[PDB]
Paper text:
The completed linker tetrasaccharide represents the point of bifurcation in GAG biosynthesis: either EXTL3 adds an α-linked GlcNAc and initiates HS polymerisation or one of two closely related CSGALNACTs adds a β-linked GalNAc and initiates CS polymerisation. We show that selection of the GAG chain type occurs at the priming step: CSGALNACTs are capable of initiating CS synthesis on all GAG attachment sites, whereas EXTL3 requires specific features in the core protein to initiate HS synthesis. Structure-function analysis reveals that acidic residues in the glycopeptide substrate and a basic exosite in EXTL3 are critical for specifying HS biosynthesis. Our results demonstrate that modification with CS occurs by default and must be overridden by EXTL3 to produce HS.
In order to explain these data mechanistically, we determined crystal structures of an EXTL3 dimer lacking the coiled-coil (residues 154–919) in the apo form (1.58 Å resolution) and with UDP and Mn2+ bound (2.10 Å resolution). The latter structure was obtained by crystal soaking that also included TetraP-BETA, but unfortunately the glycopeptide was excluded from the GlcNAc transferase site by a crystal lattice contact. The large dimer interface features an intermolecular disulfide bond (Cys793–Cys915) that staples the C-terminal tail of one subunit to the body of the other subunit. In this model, only the terminal GlcA is enclosed by the enzyme; all other linker sugars are surprisingly exposed (even the GlcA is less buried than in EXTL2 due to a Trp-to-Ser substitution in EXTL3). The Xyl2P phosphate group is ≈20 Å away from the GlcNAc transferase site and close to Arg907. This arginine is part of a large basic surface region spanning the dimer interface that has been suggested to interact with the peptide portion of acceptor substrates. We found that EXTL3 specificity is determined by a basic exosite >20 Å from the GlcNAc transferase site. The failure of EXTL3 to polymerise a long HS backbone is likely to be the result of weak acceptor binding at the GlcNAc transferase site: without assistance from the exosite, longer acceptor glycans are likely to have very high KM values, preventing efficient elongation.
Author numbering:
A (entry chain A): 154 to 163, 168 to 351, 373 to 559, 579 to 856, 869 to 919
B (entry chain B): 154 to 163, 168 to 350, 373 to 559, 579 to 857, 869 to 919
The structure:
Amino acid sequence: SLPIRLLPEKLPPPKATRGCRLHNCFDYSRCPLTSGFPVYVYDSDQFVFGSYLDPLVKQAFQATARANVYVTENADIACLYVILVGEMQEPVVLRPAELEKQLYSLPHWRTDGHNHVIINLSRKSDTQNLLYNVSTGRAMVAQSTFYTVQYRPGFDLVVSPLVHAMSEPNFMEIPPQVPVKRKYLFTFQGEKIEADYDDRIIATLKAVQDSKLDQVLVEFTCKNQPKPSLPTEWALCGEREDRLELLKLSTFALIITPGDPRLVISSGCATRLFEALEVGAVPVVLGEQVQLPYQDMLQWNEAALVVPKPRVTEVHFLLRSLSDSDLLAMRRQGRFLWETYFSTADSIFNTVLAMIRTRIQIPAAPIREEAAAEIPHRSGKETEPPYASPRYLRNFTLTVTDFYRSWNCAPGPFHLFPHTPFDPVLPSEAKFLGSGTGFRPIGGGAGGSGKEFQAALGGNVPREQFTVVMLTYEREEVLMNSLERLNGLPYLNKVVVVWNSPKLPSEDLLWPDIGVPIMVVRTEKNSLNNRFLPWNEIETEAILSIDDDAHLRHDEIMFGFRVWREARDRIVGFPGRYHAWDIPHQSWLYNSNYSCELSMVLTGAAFFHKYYAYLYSYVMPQAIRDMVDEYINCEDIAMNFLVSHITRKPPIKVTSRWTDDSHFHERHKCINFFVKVYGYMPLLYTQFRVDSVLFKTRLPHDKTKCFKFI
Amino acid sequence: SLPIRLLPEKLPPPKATRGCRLHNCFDYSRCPLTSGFPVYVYDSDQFVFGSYLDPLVKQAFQATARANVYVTENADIACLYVILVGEMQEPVVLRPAELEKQLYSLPHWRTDGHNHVIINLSRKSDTQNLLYNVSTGRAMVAQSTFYTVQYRPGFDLVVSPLVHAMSEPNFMEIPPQVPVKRKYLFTFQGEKIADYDDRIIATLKAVQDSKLDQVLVEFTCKNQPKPSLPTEWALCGEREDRLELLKLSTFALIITPGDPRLVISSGCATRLFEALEVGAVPVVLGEQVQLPYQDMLQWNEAALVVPKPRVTEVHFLLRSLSDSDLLAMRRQGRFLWETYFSTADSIFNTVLAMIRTRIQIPAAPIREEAAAEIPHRSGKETEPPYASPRYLRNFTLTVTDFYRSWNCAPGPFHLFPHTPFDPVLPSEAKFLGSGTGFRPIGGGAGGSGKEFQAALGGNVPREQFTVVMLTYEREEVLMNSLERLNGLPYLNKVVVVWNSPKLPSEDLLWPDIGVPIMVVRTEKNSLNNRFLPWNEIETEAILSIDDDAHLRHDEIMFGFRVWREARDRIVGFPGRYHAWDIPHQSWLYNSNYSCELSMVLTGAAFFHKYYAYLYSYVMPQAIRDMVDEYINCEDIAMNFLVSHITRKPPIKVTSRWTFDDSHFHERHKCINFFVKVYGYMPLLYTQFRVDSVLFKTRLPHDKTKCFKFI
Ligand SMILES: *[C@@H]1O[C@H](CO)[C@@H](O[C@@H]2O[C@H](CO)[C@@H](O[C@@H]3O[C@H](CO[C@H]4O[C@H](CO)[C@@H](O)[C@H](O)[C@@H]4O)[C@@H](O)[C@H](O[C@H]4O[C@H](CO)[C@@H](O)[C@H](O)[C@@H]4O)[C@@H]3O)[C@H](O)[C@H]2NC(C)=O)[C@H](O)[C@H]1NC(C)=O
Ligand SMILES: *[C@@H]1O[C@H](CO)[C@@H](O[C@@H]2O[C@H](CO)[C@@H](O[C@@H]3O[C@H](CO[C@H]4O[C@H](CO)[C@@H](O)[C@H](O)[C@@H]4O)[C@@H](O)[C@H](O[C@H]4O[C@H](CO)[C@@H](O)[C@H](O)[C@@H]4O)[C@@H]3O)[C@H](O)[C@H]2NC(C)=O)[C@H](O)[C@H]1NC(C)=O
Ligand SMILES: *[C@@H]1O[C@H](CO)[C@@H](O[C@@H]2O[C@H](CO)[C@@H](O)[C@H](O)[C@H]2NC(C)=O)[C@H](O)[C@H]1NC(C)=O
Ligand SMILES: *[C@@H]1O[C@H](CO)[C@@H](O[C@@H]2O[C@H](CO)[C@@H](O)[C@H](O)[C@H]2NC(C)=O)[C@H](O)[C@H]1NC(C)=O
Ligand SMILES: O=c1ccn([C@@H]2O[C@H](COP(=O)(O)OP(=O)(O)O)[C@@H](O)[C@H]2O)c(=O)[nH]1
Ligand SMILES: O=c1ccn([C@@H]2O[C@H](COP(=O)(O)OP(=O)(O)O)[C@@H](O)[C@H]2O)c(=O)[nH]1
Ligand SMILES: [Mn+2]
Ligand SMILES: [Mn+2]
């Protein structure tokens, strides 16, 4: 039933509007937990704001809003109303009290603005503060500049400046994250045009430069004129492009907050933060009174040092005491934050929406999937029928309860997945004490040797099946034979066959009958990235990805499946490979030699969770899929990069199995290009493989091996 | 150099005291980052407060403070000054403005109380607000009742009520965590003597009356309610009555006060305390509330916090949580309750650790076990022993890693020399400027068994291990197992824990194995002594080995290499498992040959020294008591500890299994007693073991196996 309705205003004083929070100014009755999060976006061209808006801000905002999955044209169902009011073109023509009157005139303002968010995105000006003397009713405000008297914490949003309006950033112009230490340990550029700690900061930082214990470069005036700025701020110097050239050479970048403690955040402070994260300079913010973009959801200490101004006398020691792996961890998290929430208009709009939505406990929209066109066909000639894995069992838990990881760990909070490899496991007594649906413990829980083992999946999670995904192209005869080797496979739910050839399968084809369905899917084009699309016909969590020419025995498939049920976030597989350091060229090589150390497992024969299919196809960078289609190669390398980036673990190699020239050199090019897209090498090494527990173990007579051969 | 000094008051208005924050009212010059965190505690028996204090509060606080590592009697070096002012015996004699004057009279108040924390711990009263009319200068306040006017976020502290004053809580009266669902879905008991309260009552009654679930909601008390603040839902009965119903509740409702200015109250904090205490997952109606320690704890992992207007959806929401998610919230509530709420020591440690953390100073180093070496005389790769570097992450573990520090076990109170959770460098960093200590196989080209034996490789810099070997009255076998160690690569030293009460014989010739052999004396004979953090252990890696174990050198080297890639786990040879006793609904120790394992016995395993500190000094005493009673089960206890911390099974290396009846049955009793201590069974199952990557693989002639036999 519907949430209780907020009672509206029947004008309100500034004490009242400063007192607004969700618990007294937001109408939850428009927003049932199960009605989605429909968002109404006002067309700013119908209101006075449109013609005063900065043109690039307006254009990038309208294009993002048009493409957004939550936006609805039906104001009657909307939970949230968005009005874009800035930033405005300078000099600001419109007077404050006029800006107020047009806000109170918006079509769905009702009496007070409840459930509206006012968006005001900075791009060229660091001195605008359009809403300062404006009464906003019960609306929330999203902008980059706030004084204390205007910031309502937990209700307003501090957001990032819009830099890449009507453009795309170039991930190739970002310096690599390694080497850790750059030319300068830290730098700062600014100018101030006049408790005052500012004078001890300057004296301490100058003394560090003059000591010549580290290479630093600190400058408290600009070569030319400084950009205008708010009072007591350290104004920016030069153009975006000048400042970046220096920050690209800095291990750390100083950000000295404004001298007036009432300036909670400013356009200028957030710009410096934006620019430092953009190129991997770890921010060092002096002044704990600041509110950084998105601070209610992001743990900023993981990407930035935030330090009271009185500890300036200890900054030099502190920056010298951080290890290389801690410092590189901070750089790697600043890249995640900057890409996900700062870098484009889409990033920013998705962050505003997702912040408001999470604060009111509504799950994200469900990530799309690949609607498949089945190619119907005709077939030729344990004890139960296929069962799908349950879906969407954690809507509230992944949104609210897992708040920290949702927002501070990749891939971020914007999508709802049908399932994930990070679901917590039950303690091992719960299956015997009331939570046993689907559990199949070996030997009823007493365990045993090979007899009992083969009679039950066991493990720490309920039983399930897996889906085979088999890519094929112009190989109609070998396909039918390998499809037949799957007859009798335990726990097989269905086979999905991805038909890449442009010529459909001949009408007169007698596919085998293997006891489970065989769906043949049509592909709008011929790509190796098509094996990782999240086909709606895949109804399990587990995928066994296999080439139409791969020869796995049934016992291998079953041992791999049980390993993966205990390593659900990993690529678990058979073909082990590794990346080799090209010593003279200081670069990477693909290496498939026999080896005692591995770092990739090829997806021509491996288990992985369908979660990574959604990521590979819709969240990972386009430049990587672009390159897979160019070389018709390397999709297995890209998927080991993705999974090892998300998990920071190597893959897992199962059993002792191990199985032209311009193709092989395409794989050195791929490894080195993928490293430029990510900023670093995510692959890691393992010095073991997994076998069954009693592999090659001598046993008494009343005991049996788990498998005959593996 | 010292931090910049805060400029003192030369009386201040209420607008000034309400704006105090660390950035304008704390004097960082008393608190350099590297001078520790010395705390001065005023003796409240010298000031007016002492005779009015509740005597049990006063006695429990003074006891904790006398035993606290940070506390000093030298007020000249102190960074923080602590004064206990409450709670006071009822009816409260002392008038407000008097309490103000004794505060300004404190010996080291100086002019304004800077760097003072005022502590006011509740126990018996739910109506006290001692400091409401009291000017506090620049001092922080730590207490359980705050109105909005008085609460300074980020500066004041919301703490737990002091329930077990001068007592210890009994962990065996805590109902077990499983089964997940208990008799009632939720319960509530209280009486009350925008206004959403009427719809809440109506809604919750309708849920009771629907008989879709078993619930018990009562909006008056059997007898007279405890006194409370206005608009509060007052507590009913005595602590022992409320807990008997909560013990049977899956969820406990907490309905926050009707006046939104009452940010938190003793009565709300008591309901939170009692719910967590017995495993009822709190459901808090009202987001305006500030829960204890909320600046540091992510409460959404332990409680559902829900706007009052969404009461109409609470029933739907409680039914939609999966079993594994509800259990994870119960297990997190227990961690929070025990670490920060349960005793006077918990509370006082938490107040100190909050303020210390907020000013970026690391925790006191955990103690180690000063070894008394027993000098002895000895009989008759190319480098000399190197110890592991220590304390490389003081700032990062305190500030950067804030979330895990506070919200994951073991909590934030100790600084360890090193941990198994240090982040790993991306694999190109060893070649591009961070290569100190790294020994990659084939210099980064890799290879086969030849190169693999020449270099540890891996993802971490090289290091060594220490053998710890327990012995008791087996003088002849000891010398012989010590001699098996001669020649072992990467061995730093051998620490021999001499558990026999009779010293070694003076005429003893110990072997000379090429490294030192330290023989340490034990004050008593305990199996716990193999897990004490002897200050002679100079490495991170420990190879725990009984005096009668035969490990070959290759086994040790492959085990060491697995651990270097699995640093948080027990990595070892002897696999065992816990088996469910189907008729008695309880656990059994089982050592049969098995295809599924859950334990690795520490009689032959690698683990990180970090877990010796935890086993000895943090893990509950009752577990070490039982190990001493039966002289048994130290290996089951350490498997419980490590699987509790990591929620992962151990790792079993190679095919080795090979190595009276009242001993075997003591092990059933340990497993089932430990489950009572923890509240749940932490062990988990694995259906694989590890072997080298080319174990039993058919290799060309230009390639060599990693090891000859494993
Ligand atoms: C099994 O393991 C072996 C041993 O590690 C691998 O052998 C290496 O293969 C790589 C790539 O094929 C070789 O590296 C390349 O060398 C080129 C010049 O090599 C000559 O010189 C060596 C000895 O000095 C001869 O043995 C060889 O026959 C050649 O005559 C460079 O031009 C290459 O650089 C290219 O790519 C990089 C990107 O990283 C660019 O910077 C360059 O401009 C260029 O475009 C590269 O360095 C290496 O020499 C081989 N080692 C040995 C000892 O022979 C096998 O490839 C591996 N097998 C499999 C299947 O993976
Ligand atoms: C290798 O694997 C086997 C098979 O799982 C293990 O055998 C089991 O051993 C356990 C414990 O030793 C046995 O469990 C106990 O059973 C007692 C009654 O058993 C009788 O009945 C069976 C058949 O019904 C006979 O075969 C047996 O010889 C006996 O005559 C119970 O009384 C025990 O309960 C005790 O502990 C619990 C705590 O959980 C308390 O609550 C009780 O009060 C009581 O004090 C217990 O349930 C089990 O019967 C054995 N199974 C079989 C088939 O023999 C081996 O132990 C294992 N070996 C190794 C080395 O691990
Ligand atoms: C969890 O979220 C999913 C996705 O938003 C919900 O699934 C939708 O449920 C409605 C109502 O049954 C259906 O009409 C849609 O077809 C479903 N969408 C999809 C993509 O499956 C699900 O109901 C939510 N679960 C809970 C417990 O709230
Ligand atoms: C990290 O913390 C440790 C533990 O407090 C510091 O170690 C102490 O340092 C002082 C001065 O160097 C010595 O006199 C003590 O003996 C040390 N204690 C121990 C237990 O070794 C260490 O200096 C800190 N490191 C940094 C970089 O701040
Ligand atoms: O243009 C192409 C070429 C290949 N494939 C598929 O890609 C996989 C890998 O190709 P192949 O087995 O020929 O490589 P190999 O593993 O033999 O080196 C197989 O499933 C092919 O059917 C494809 O979909 N399109
Ligand atoms: O009172 C005792 C009994 C045993 N042990 C040690 O405990 C370990 C394991 O004991 P034992 O080998 O006797 O058990 P087993 O492994 O042979 O069953 C050995 O290192 C013993 O020296 C000990 O320190 N004190
Ligand atoms: Mn193939
Ligand atoms: Mn032994």
